[PDB]
Design a protein around this ligand. Structure first.
Ligand SMILES: CCCCCCCC(=O)OC[C@H](N)C=O
Ligand SMILES: *[C@@H]1O[C@H](CO)[C@@H](O)[C@H](O)[C@H]1NC(C)=O
Length: 352
């Protein structure tokens, strides 16, 4: 039908965690010169014991053995005008997340797991050139959660790749959704034993060495050798980016609260935790005041750009698809939309 069809990478040396071939889903649209490449999320694992436990409970995120042959685009990947009013006719690409490395892993493997997230992106771009990308006018690299952080790490690498390959007319852009995190203090400190409850700084310090991860070169210059973990955090890597990037971020991101050891039950929140949550949104609000193209509602949620109801969230009377359209036209109707109200779900258009 309108579905994206699975393609496995021809270079079988670029694999998922377990050695199965990586791949991508593609839906071609011959009349359009716009391309949407989406990076999937799904946390990470930074040592053998967590990656083994991840392999037993969430096998889809470390292997391609169970991928379906087709997939339906949703949200900004949907081809239905009612669901994607501005970009429904674009070429759609969906890259599944099977490297557990926040799309940072490079180099090859010895014997346990392989971490080739940055090489998977590179190889998809190579193959897509033979399937019509060579004629593109705009390449928008998008992603959610871990894929959103992966956009910040890879958007300038794709730009330089396409220049080196001889396609300087393609305008490369980035869209990072729910990948803008703070290396802050936990609400209640725990020891870095499990994945989702290890502090953000320590998680990336261990991960980048375990994955052989790479960061943008211009950001690596700003921090001491051995402190490359800084470049995994949006407000530190953003000032050195060269491609234009639109930042979508819930002010109270639920994944951010998870690594901060905050667990929301159906109880009434006490003070100090209410203060902690309130202080989080203010610091994230502060990091965005110099980001011209941003969209930050004051909700407690995670991810949105490939959810079907992304057309319903609005900040100051402007929807998310509208803001992306205004940003699109400005590169050839505001684009800086951050909520001013400081408590969660003060925006009436928050999801449920
Ligand atoms: C600074 C690094 C923090 C990365 C946190 C990533 C969280 C995530 O990737 O969330 C996945 C979501 N549950 C599914 O898509
Ligand atoms: C295939 O991938 C491997 C993995 O790193 C790489 O070393 C090699 O150069 C690639 N070859 C081609 C033709 O893409």
């Amino acid at each position: 039908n309108e579905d994206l069809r699975l393609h496995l990478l021809l270079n079988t040396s670029v694999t998922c965690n377990d050695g199965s071939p990586a791949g991508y889903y593609l839906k071609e649209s011959r009349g359009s010169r716009r391309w949407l490449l989406f990076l999937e999320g799904g946390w990470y694992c930074f040592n053998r014991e967590n990656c083994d436990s991840r392999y037993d409970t969430m096998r889809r995120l470390m292997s391609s053995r169970d991928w379906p042959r087709t997939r339906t685009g949703t949200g900004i990947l949907s081809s239905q005008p009612e669901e994607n009013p501005y970009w429904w006719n674009a070429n759609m690409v969906f890259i599944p997340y099977c490297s557990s490395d926040v799309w940072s892993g490079a180099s090859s493997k010895s014997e346990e797991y392989a971490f080739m997230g940055a090489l998977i992106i590179q190889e998809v771009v190579r193959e897509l050139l033979g399937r019509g990308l060579s004629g593109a006018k705009v390449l928008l690299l998008a992603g959610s959660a871990a894929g959103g952080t992966g956009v910040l790490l890879n958007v300038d690498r794709v730009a330089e790749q396409l220049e080196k390959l001889g396609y300087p007319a393609i305008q490369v852009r980035g869209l990072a959704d729910s990948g803008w995190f703070l290396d802050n203090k936990q609400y209640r400190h725990t020891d870095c034993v499990d994945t989702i409850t290890c502090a953000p700084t320590e998680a990336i310090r261990r991960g980048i060495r375990y994955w052989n991860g790479v960061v943008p070169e211009r950001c690596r210059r700003q921090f001491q050798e051995g402190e490359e973990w800084n470049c995994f955090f949006g407000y530190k890597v953003y000032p050195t980016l060269r491609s234009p990037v639109f930042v979508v971020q819930w002010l109270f991101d639920e994944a951010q609260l998870t690594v901060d050891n905050v667990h929301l039950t159906g109880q009434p929140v006490q003070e100090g935790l209410r203060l902690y949550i309130q202080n989080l949104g203010r610091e994230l609000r502060h990091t965005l005041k110099d980001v011209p193209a941003s969209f930050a509602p004051a909700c407690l949620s995670h991810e949105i750009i490939i959810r079907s109801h992304w057309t319903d969230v609005q900040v100051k009377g402007t929807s998310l698809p509208r803001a992306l359209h205004c940003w699109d036209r400005s590169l050839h109707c505001p684009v800086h939309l951050v909520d001013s109200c400081p408590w969660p779900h003060c925006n009436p258009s928050c999801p449920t």
